[PDB]
Amino acid sequence: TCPFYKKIPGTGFTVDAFQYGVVEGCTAYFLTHFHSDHYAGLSKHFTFPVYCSEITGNLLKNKLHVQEQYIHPLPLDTECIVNGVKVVLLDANHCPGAVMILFYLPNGTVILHTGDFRADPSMERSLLADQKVHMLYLDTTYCSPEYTFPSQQEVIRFAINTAFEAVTLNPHALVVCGTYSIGKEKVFLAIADVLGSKVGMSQEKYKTLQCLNIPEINSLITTDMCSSLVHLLPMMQINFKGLQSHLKKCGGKYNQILAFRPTGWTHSNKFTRIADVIPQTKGNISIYGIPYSEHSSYLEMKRFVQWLKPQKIIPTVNVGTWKSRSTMEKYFREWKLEAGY
């Protein structure tokens, strides 16, 4: 049964609520982004209307084989009417096709559902600027002060320089990058670009990346592993056994692997600067964990909320414990008092 925080009151709408069968009174199902925790339950047998972005629509049709007639893509930054309710989709600065959703309720309430997001000051000059928000359904993944990490730009810089150094020292080194879902594509795209290679991957991943409207994509990726010196593998295989095995497959083309695991946050952020990061090494294999996040830091989250000044905040992540709920309400109150709303 559907939790209250996936219901938009005063409408027939839910958000990211596909794992509860037929939700009583829901006449349209919104999907914020193609991550499995959020799409859990969708398949080709789904017969209610789904509303999402164009990219999310591509993946529904091609990967989950949902039927065309039930997929309703909407343009971003465009006031649209759905079952008599004005809505807007906004870029969530998360993974490709990921959106925030504004609901303008009949009674005059305004609701923002962030989906998954990484807050940015650029959001302060969207169609959010023009009016008040009464309720915020907030991605609270890292709502605690200890969750710090760098900008995406600094991390990519670290990765690019690391990889270019290693391959210029050893032309026979291979670079590997782990993956298990969409998002974080810049990590492998940037590395392949500075090395002047295409990124090589399995057919199922190539199919997925083909759904994402990246410009010039056919120039950047390929299924021919033999022609590329940047390979993507499942995240699970990014370890000393998985990598030794894969090196064997390359038939003595390469004598060294440099691999990258893009995590979210790790406790090595409480002490170490991005510049200071070092690999785990075994023989001719090195592994870097790099903190490339597609969720708000604590400070980025605080800044957005303090800018938005909502009247009520409803968390969508870390809701399952009392300790977590309690902690989050404290920070909300602090933020409210500090900025005076």
Ligand code: NI
């Ligand atoms: Ni997500």
